[PDB]
């Protein structure tokens, strides 16, 4: 009932997205769950990205293997901190924000 992210193999990622992450969580249902990445903007709006994965990536209801979404700006030169959270689809309830760090692509 409560949504909780109890662990992530990694909490930083490249802005280019596409990187794979293991996440451990409290009970969830493979078809009623999503991983929302978000960042508060100056104007009050919010940038949001979703972790990519298929309900089969939801492991025995307690972990999700998925890939990170691309950050809003793949050019930043300094890391940009954002938030990640589990979000249930049926009621849009969410877990407590976890902090995620997007670092520049080094090209």
């Amino acid at each position: 009932s409560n949504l909780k992210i109890v662990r992530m193999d990694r909490t930083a990622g490249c802005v280019t997205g596409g990187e794979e992450i293991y996440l451990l969580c409290d009970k969830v249902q493979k078809d009623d769950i999503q991983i929302r990445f978000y960042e508060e903007e100056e104007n009050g709006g919010v940038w949001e990205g979703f972790g990519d994965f298929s309900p089969t990536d939801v492991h025995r209801q307690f972990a999700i293997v998925f890939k990170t979404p691309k950050y809003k700006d793949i050019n930043i030169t300094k890391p940009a901190s954002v938030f990640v959270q589990l979000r249930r689809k049926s009621d849009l309830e969410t877990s407590e924000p976890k902090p995620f760090l997007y670092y520049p692509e080094i090209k």
């Binding site: 992530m8 909490t11 670092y103």
Partner: protein, 213 residues
């Protein structure tokens, strides 16, 4: 400027031409654009200085005013490196010099693996750096991002009774819990050390045993 993204300053230090370096950083004055130049591994002259154990060159680069907070490709500031490598001189130079409140920021920052200076020092066994970082203002109860572990947890995880003792001596909260709701004591089950389990059995009775179901 060179191939691997390295400038002449980078080389000046990489090949340990202290003389040249001492001078380059002297002839070329207060120019950040060049003193904070990062290479392809995103390392700055400061990073290289401490990686190659040359305290003075780093002390100089700092004097010339470089940036102590720039992160390498692993998200590390030079101090992070200094603590990860156990070089106690480098640590001193990197914490004595920039007495600026930038210290509080550095001591607070984690790298891309979610590690603070105290964490890196604790991961290896550098108790002297650990204790120094604490008296300097690093928070012994700082939690790592991936699981919410504190240096104390890591200590149990590393089965290091000496680190445990030091942390408790520094006021570490034995009842701080990870995101899974566990105390350092609770991470002892499944691990061999009984000494650690003794050092810790002074934490809430409700935080000692695991759960069932």
């Amino acid at each position: 400027l060179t191939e691997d993204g390295d400038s002449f300053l980078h080389l000046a230090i990489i090949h340990e031409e202290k003389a040249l370096t001492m001078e380059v950083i002297r002839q070329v004055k207060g120019d950040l654009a060049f003193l904070n130049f990062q290479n392809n591994l995103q390392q700055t002259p400061l990073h290289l200085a401490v990686i190659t154990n040359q305290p003075e060159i780093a002390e100089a680069l700092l004097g010339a005013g470089c940036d102590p907070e720039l992160r390498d490709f692993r998200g590390n500031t030079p101090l992070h490196l200094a603590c990860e490598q156990g070089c106690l001189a480098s640590v001193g130079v990197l914490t004595q010099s920039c007495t600026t409140p930038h210290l509080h920021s550095i001591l607070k920052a984690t790298n891309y693996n979610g590690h603070t200076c105290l964490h890196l020092a604790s991961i290896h066994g550098y108790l002297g750096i650990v204790e120094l970082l604490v008296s300097l203002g690093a928070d012994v109860n700082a939690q790592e991002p991936c699981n919410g572990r504190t240096a104390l947890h890591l200590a149990v995880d590393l089965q290091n009774p000496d680190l445990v003792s030091l942390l408790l001596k520094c006021g570490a909260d034995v009842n701080r819990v990870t995101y899974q709701g566990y105390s350092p004591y609770q991470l002892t089950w499944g691990r061999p050390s009984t000494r650690i389990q003794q050092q810790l059995g002074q934490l809430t009775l409700e935080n000692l045993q695991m759960l069932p179901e």
